[PDB]
Amino acid sequence: SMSVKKPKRDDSKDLALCSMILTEMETHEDAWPFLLPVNLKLVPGYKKVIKKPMDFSTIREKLSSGQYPNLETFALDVRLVFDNCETFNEDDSDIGRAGHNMRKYFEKKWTDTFK
Numbered sequence: 001s002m003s004v005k006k007p008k009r010d011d012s013k014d015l016a017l018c019s020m021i022l023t024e025m026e027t028h029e030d031a032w033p034f035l036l037p038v039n040l041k042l043v044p045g046y047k048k049v050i051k052k053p054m055d056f057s058t059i060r061e062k063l064s065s066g067q068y069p070n071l072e073t074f075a076l077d078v079r080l081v082f083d084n085c086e087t088f089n090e091d092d093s094d095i096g097r098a099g100h101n102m103r104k105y106f107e108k109k110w111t112d113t114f115k
Contacts (some may be wrong), residue, residue, distance in 0.1 A: 014071045018063060021109045025078070026056055028105060030098040034081055050088060054080040071114065078106055 025031060037055045040047040059077050061067075068074045085099035 011071070015063075017113050018068070018071055018074045021106070021113060022056065022060060022063060022078075024109060025102065025106060026060070028102060030101045031056065033085065033095045033098050034102065046088065050084050052080060052084075054084060056081070075110060079103075082106075 026035070034056050036057050038046050038050070038053055040053070046053070054077050059074070059081070062077065063074065068077075082099050082103040085095065089096040089099065091097070091100070
């Protein structure tokens, strides 16, 4: 509360560390469904159904330009990518499986880097 603070967690490396995680996600072989924004002209149903599209290239631009106020807002956009994928793709599809794999990969990197 006022003039009463928990000890200051060092967040000075968070930008660099999120960048490295994002690099590792970018270079994963199952990243291909997620590298660029879904083409909203060419994928029927996407625009109406997925209220907040997100992809790695959009996260990367947001990261590079100081649009994440903290590491939790960064994790929320990464998770959004996978939540969107699950909303639109069957579990038993290449893209559906890619999404589950990438989410797993991300969550472990996140835990090991920050928890």
